[PDB]
Amino acid sequence: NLSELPNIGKVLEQDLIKAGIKTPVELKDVGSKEAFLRIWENDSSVCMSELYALEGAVQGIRWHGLDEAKKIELKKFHQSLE
Amino acid sequence: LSELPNIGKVLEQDLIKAGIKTPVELKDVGSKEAFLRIWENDSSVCMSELYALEGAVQGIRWHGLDEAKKIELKKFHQSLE
């Protein structure tokens, strides 16, 4: 049911699961960044898209609609990564 | 242009700034070159976004792309810087 929670694609829930994050409530209290990092530990290829997708799912909206402040914040942490 | 699959507002918009304004335009150039064109504007544009477009020219949701082409696409992103 990770397939509900908007923004999440078939391959995103693929690695979310790999990272040990099934169920929406497992990802709600670790939040996007953490989830992001975990899956990144697996494929270095994850990226900004997935970051937004994850925090989109935690707020209950499609990410293009995340509020700005919050998107800089995610950009800063993504770009701070590598 | 956001009438094709896998293309959100942002992807659309940055294709716009890239010189690709239409679904037909996106099909002449294919995805490899479309993507290459925005990479130059945003050196850090996701691989998820190279799939989406190829998903786009062809008529499907990208997770349904045959594994051979994702492997080719992946490889091409890696060649990118």
Residue with tokens 């800089």: A72
Within 8 A by CB and 6+ apart from A77, the residues are A33, A51
The backbone torsions φ and ψ at residue A15, rounded to the nearest 5 degrees and listed phi first, read -75, -25
Cβ–Cβ < 8 Å for B61, B5: yes
Cβ–Cβ < 8 Å for A16, A36: no
- E strands, A1-82, are none
Element (H, E) at B52: helix B48-57
Residue of A3, A7, A45 to mutate, testing the B interface (most B Cβ within 10 Å of its Cβ): A45
The boundaries of the domain holding residue B78 are: 1-81
Q: Resolution of this entry in Å?
A: 2.9
Q: Give the whole-angstrom CA distance, residue B31 versus residue B5.
A: 13
- By what technique were these coordinates determined? X-ray
Q: Give the whole-angstrom CA distance, residue A82 versus residue B55.
A: 27
Cβ–Cβ < 8 Å for B7, B21: no
CATH number at residue B2: 1.10.150.20
Question: CA B67, A40, B64 angle in degrees (round to 5)?
Answer: 25
Number of neighbours of residue B46 by Cβ within 10 angstroms: 21
Which of B10, B44, B49 faces A64 most closely, judged by CB atoms? B10
Tokens for B55, please give them. 């998903």
Question: CA A3, A47, A77 angle in degrees (round to 5)?
Answer: 110
Contacts 24+ apart (CB under 8 A), A40-49: A40/A81, A42/A15, A42/A18, A43/A15, A45/B47, A45/B74, A45/B77, A46/A15, A47/A78, A47/B44, A47/B46, A47/B47, A47/B48, A48/A74, A48/A75, A48/A78, A48/B44, A48/B46, A49/B46, A49/B48, A49/B49
In chain B, residues with a C-beta closer than 8 Å to the C-beta of A49 are 46, 48-49
Say if the Cβ atoms of B49 and A49 lie within 8 Å. yes
Number of structural domains found in chain A: 1
Residue with tokens 């994702």: B70
